[PDB]
Design a protein around this ligand. Sequence first.
Ligand code: UZ6
Ligand code: UZ6
Ligand code: UZ6
Ligand code: UZ6
Lengths: 261, 261, 261, 261
Amino acid sequence: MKYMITSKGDEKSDLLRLNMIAGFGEYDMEYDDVEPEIVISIGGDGTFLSAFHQYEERLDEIAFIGIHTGHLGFYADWRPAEADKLVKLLAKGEYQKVSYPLLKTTVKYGKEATYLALNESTVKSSGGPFVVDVVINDIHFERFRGDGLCMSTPSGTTAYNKSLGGALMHPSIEAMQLTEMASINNRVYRTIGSPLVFPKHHVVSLQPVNDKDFQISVDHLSILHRDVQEIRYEVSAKKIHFARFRSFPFWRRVHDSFIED
Amino acid sequence: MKYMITSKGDEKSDLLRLNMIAGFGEYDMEYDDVEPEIVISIGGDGTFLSAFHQYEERLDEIAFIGIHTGHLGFYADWRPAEADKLVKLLAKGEYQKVSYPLLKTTVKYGKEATYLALNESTVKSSGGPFVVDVVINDIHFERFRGDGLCMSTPSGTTAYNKSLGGALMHPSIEAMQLTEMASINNRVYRTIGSPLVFPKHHVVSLQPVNDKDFQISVDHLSILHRDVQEIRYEVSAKKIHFARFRSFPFWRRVHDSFIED
Amino acid sequence: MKYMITSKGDEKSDLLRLNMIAGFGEYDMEYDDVEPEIVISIGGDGTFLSAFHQYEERLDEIAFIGIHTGHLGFYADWRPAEADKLVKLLAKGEYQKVSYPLLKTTVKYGKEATYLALNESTVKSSGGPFVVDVVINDIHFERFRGDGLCMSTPSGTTAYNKSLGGALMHPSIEAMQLTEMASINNRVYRTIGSPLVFPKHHVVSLQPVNDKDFQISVDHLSILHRDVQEIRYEVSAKKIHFARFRSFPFWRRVHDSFIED
Amino acid sequence: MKYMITSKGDEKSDLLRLNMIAGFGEYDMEYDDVEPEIVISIGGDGTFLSAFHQYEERLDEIAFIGIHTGHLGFYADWRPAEADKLVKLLAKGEYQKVSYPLLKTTVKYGKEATYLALNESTVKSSGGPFVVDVVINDIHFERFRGDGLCMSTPSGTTAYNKSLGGALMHPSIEAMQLTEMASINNRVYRTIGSPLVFPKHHVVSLQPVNDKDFQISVDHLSILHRDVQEIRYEVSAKKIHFARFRSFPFWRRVHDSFIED
Ligand SMILES: CCNC(=O)NC[C@H]1O[C@@H](n2c(C#CCN(CCCN)C[C@H]3O[C@@H](n4cnc5c(N)ncnc54)[C@H](O)[C@@H]3O)nc3c(N)ncnc32)[C@H](O)[C@@H]1O
Ligand SMILES: CCNC(=O)NC[C@H]1O[C@@H](n2c(C#CCN(CCCN)C[C@H]3O[C@@H](n4cnc5c(N)ncnc54)[C@H](O)[C@@H]3O)nc3c(N)ncnc32)[C@H](O)[C@@H]1O
Ligand SMILES: CCNC(=O)NC[C@H]1O[C@@H](n2c(C#CCN(CCCN)C[C@H]3O[C@@H](n4cnc5c(N)ncnc54)[C@H](O)[C@@H]3O)nc3c(N)ncnc32)[C@H](O)[C@@H]1O
Ligand SMILES: CCNC(=O)NC[C@H]1O[C@@H](n2c(C#CCN(CCCN)C[C@H]3O[C@@H](n4cnc5c(N)ncnc54)[C@H](O)[C@@H]3O)nc3c(N)ncnc32)[C@H](O)[C@@H]1O
C-alpha cells in the first residue's frame, strides 16, 4: 500500500530509510507522503511524536510503526536489525492494528484552538506565578498554585507523567491523568496532591485567576497563549493506530525500559 | 422491600437505627437480615465495609446505603439529619443504582482461598523480610523487596492507596491499582516505584522467593497465610451496587473530604 | 538606634508603617535607610525577602524584624496588632539576635557573579532541555536531566524545597539542601532522586553538558545567564540576623503554618 | 593492638577471617574479643550492624572496619581482595579515625530502656492502628495516624530513610531525621508529610493516644514494648569511630551504591 518513512536525520537513520525504500521497491508499495496508509518513523520517540503530528488529520487512515536507532523508545517496536523482516511483513500485510487513546486540549480566548496529544499537554505560566482554578465537569475542585499541571494519555504515563509521580496506566484504559508540578500547600493554599485519573467524557477545565497568559505544551511543542479564558482537557474520540507484527506487551515494554534489558 | 440496618454501636447510631426502623414500619417494608434487598449502614466507612462483607455472597441482590454519624465517610451519602428523608425515598423506591468495581484476591497453597475487596488487599511478610516476584499476565516484571504491596479498587484509591502515593481514579473505570510500600532501590535491587494501573482481565501474581508466610489484609481484615505459593489479583466480575437518591459526584466527594467542606 | 521600615505598599501596610514611625519619634531613634541597624519589613515573606536583598551588603550590621499584615509569613514574628508593643521593645533594645544560615551561588562565564539567597537558588534551562553534570567536591556525582534543580537554605526548606519533597531542617543546622524538579529516570538516565543535604564547606557545582544558557533564580529574582561554564553552591560565611523579643520556636512556626493555627 | 573479626558465616567470610587472623599473627597483634581496639566485620551491612551492637558499650575504645564479601555495603571500605593490604596497614597503625553520629532512643513505661542506633529506630503498632502525638521540645507538633515513623541517623539516611523519601545527609552533620510511613491525610487528619531534620539537643517524644503497645526496631532488631508512656529520640552524645586508610568520600560511596559502579 501507500507508505512513507520519516527519519531523525542522522546518518544511521537516513541510510536505514534509504534501504527500506529500496526493499519496498521490490513489492506493490508506493512511496506517498501525502496520503500514506503506513507511516514508519526511524529514530527515537521524539521522531515518532513528530510523525504523529505530521499526520494528525488522517489518523483513522494510517497505521504507525516505530524503529529505534538509539536505545529502546517506547513507541518503537523494532530494532534497526529487523528492518528487512519488517519490510517483508508489511509487504504481505494482514497484520493487526492496536489503538491507543489520545488527549484533546481546547484553548479558549477573547477564539478557540484545539490540539491532540499522544504523550501529554502541560500548562505553566508565561512567567510570573501560575494560579488556576481546576473545574471538573463544572464542579470547582481546587485552586492550584505552583509550577504547572500535566495531563497525560495512557501511553504518556511512562513519560513526563512518571517523573511527576503519576501512575503508569495500561493503554487499553480510555482515560487521562492529571499530575501536579510543585504545588504550594500550607494552611492557606491546598491542592489534592495526588494524581487524578479521569474517564472518557469527563472534562477538566483550567480557569485563570489573575494572569491570563500561559505556556501550553503538547508533546514536544510549546506555545505561548495570551488572553486565555479556559483550557479544557478531555479524552479524544480519535485514536492512534499501530501496525503490530508480534506480541510486545505494554508491561513487558515497561519492564524493558525501566527495570532491565 | 426487604431491608436491614447495621450500626456502629454507639448510642447515636443505635438510636438512629431504631428510629429508621420505626419509620420503615409505616411502609410496605419488612426487616430481614437474611435476604435484604437494601442494606443501610449507620456509622463510618469501617461500618460500611463490615456491611459489605456481611453480604458479600448476595451482592447482586442488594443495594447499599451509608449514613455517616461522624465526619463524612466516603461510602456515606447521607448525614443523620436526612434519615427521615431517606426512609421516605427508599419507601417509594424507583431510585437508580450505581455500581463500583471490586478486587478479587486468590491465595494458593500446598488449597485455594478467594477474597473480595471494596477498598484494597495488601500483603506484607509475617515478620522477616518481604520479597516477592511480581508477575503480570505471566511476564516476570520485577522482584519487589520492601515493606509490602497494596492493590486498590477505584473507590479504594482515596484510602490506603492515596497514602502510598497512588492516583485517585474515578470508579467508573474498571481497574485495580498496585502501589509499593517502602521498596529498596540501589544498584542491586530495582522496582518500578510508580503506581501501576491494570485493566479488567489482567492478572497480577505475587510469587514467594524465600519465605512463604504472609500477612494478607482485605479491607479491615488481616489474616496470616502459611505456605503460600501464589497470590493472584484481578478485577472481579462482581460489583457493589449503591442506591442513589441525588447527585453526589465522586469528584465532589473527593473535594469535600480532602480539600474543604 | 538607626532603623528603617519597608512596606508591601497596600494601605494597611503603609498606614502601619506611618504609625510605627510616629511611635519611634517618641524615642532616641533616627529613621535612616542608608545605614540602619534595624530593618522592619511590613508585609509578607516576599516583602521580607526584598528587605533582605536591599541590605545584603550590611547584613552584619543589621537586625531584621518581619510584621505580617496578611496571613502568617514565615519570616514574620509579629502581627500588626503588636506593632506598638514592638516599638517599645525595640526602643529599649537589649533584645537578643538569632542568626540563620545563607546560600552563596557563584555563576562563572567566558566573568563571575555571586548571589546570596535567604530561601533558595534554582536553575532551569533557558528553554530547551535542562541537562547538567552535578559535581560534589570535584567528584562527578550524576548527570541530571529534567526540569531543574533547587538549592535551599535551612529557613528556605519550608518554601519551594518543601513542594519538591525536601526535608524541613532546623535553621541552627549550617547546611544547604538540593532537590530535583521532575528528573527523567529510565534504564539510560539515572539520578539519585532523594534530596541531598550538604554541610558547610562542601561545594556543589553544576556543569553544562550541551546548552550553556540557564535561568537562575535567587529568592524572588530570576535572571537569564548566557554562556555559563559553572554554577557553584556553598553555604555562605554570611548570616542573617533577626531581632528576637520572645520565644517563637521554629518547630512551632512550622506547626502554625502547616498543621493548624 | 587488640583486635577481633566477626564473620557473616558463609564459607567465603569464614575463610577470609581465618586468613586475616593468620596474617595478623605475623605482627604485634593479639586476638581479643573481650576488649578489642579494632573490630573488623566481614560480610555485609547487617554483619556490620551486628558488630556495632556487640560492642556498643565500648564505642569510645574501638575503631570499626567493614569488608564486604557481597556487593558494596555502605559501612564497607574494603573488598575481600584488599584484606592483605588491610592487615599490613592496620598492623603499622597511624591511621586516622572518622566519627559518625548515633541515635539514642529512650522507652518509658509504667521503667526505662535505652537503645543506640547506627541506622535508625522505627516504631509501629503492635497490631491495630498506630496513633501517636509527636512532641518536639515539649511543643505538641502533630497527631500522627498511619503505618509508623522512622528516625534515622545521618549514615542511616541511605537506608530505610531513603525508601521513605527522606533526604540523604552527610554524616558530619550532627542530626537525626524523622520520616513518615503512610500517614492518613484528609480534612480531619493532618501531618506535616515532609521529613523533618533535627539538630543535637532537640528531643522528639512520641506519646500514645489510645493503644500503648508498640513494636520498636533499632537497626535489625525489633522488640514488642508494652504499656508505653513515651518514646524519646535525641542525637546521642556517643559516636561510632571508623579506621580510615584512604579517601572514600561519603558522596562517592552514595554515587557508587545508587548511581553506578
Ligand atoms: C527530560 C526531557 N525530555 C526527554 O528527555 N524526553 C525524551 C526521553 O523520553 C522518552 N519518552 C518519550 C519521549 C519523547 C520526546 N521528548 C523530546 C525530547 C527531545 N530529544 C518529548 C517528551 O519528553 C517528555 N518530558 C519532558 N519533560 C520531561 C521531564 N522532566 N521528565 C520526563 N519526561 C519529560 C514529555 O513526555 C515529552 O512529550 N515518550 C515516552 C513515553 N511515552 N514513555 C516513555 N518514555 C518516553 C524518550 O524515549 C527519551 O528517553
Ligand atoms: C490509618 C488507619 N486507617 C484508618 O484510619 N482508616 C479510617 C479512615 O479511612 C477513611 N476511609 C476508608 C476507611 C476505612 C476503615 N478502616 C478501618 C478503620 C477502623 N477505625 C480500614 C481502611 O483503612 C485504610 N488504611 C489502612 N492503613 C492506612 C494508612 N496507613 N493510610 C491510610 N488509610 C489506611 C484502608 O484503606 C482500610 O481499608 N475507606 C475510604 C475510602 N475508600 N476513601 C477515603 N477514605 C476512606 C475513613 O473514612 C477514615 O477517615
Ligand atoms: C508558588 C509561588 N510562590 C509563592 O506563592 N510564594 C509565597 C508563599 O510562600 C511563602 N513562603 C516564602 C515566600 C515567598 C515569596 N515568594 C514570592 C511570592 C510573590 N507573591 C517567593 C518564594 O516563593 C517560593 N516558591 C516559588 N515557587 C514555589 C512553588 N512551586 N512551591 C512553593 N513555593 C514556591 C520560593 O521559595 C520563593 O523564594 N518563603 C517561605 C519560607 N521560607 N517558608 C515557608 N513559606 C514561605 C509565603 O509566606 C507565601 O505563602
Ligand atoms: C528491605 C529490607 N532490608 C534490607 O534488605 N536491608 C539490607 C540492604 O540495606 C543496605 N543497607 C543497610 C543495611 C542493612 C541490614 N538490614 C538487615 C538485612 C538482613 N539481610 C537492616 C536494615 O535494613 C533497612 N531496611 C529495613 N526495611 C527497609 C526498607 N523497606 N527499605 C529499605 N531499607 C530497609 C534498615 O535501614 C535496617 O537497619 N544499611 C545501609 C545504609 N546505612 N545505607 C545504605 N544501604 C544500607 C544493605 O547494604 C542491603 O543492601
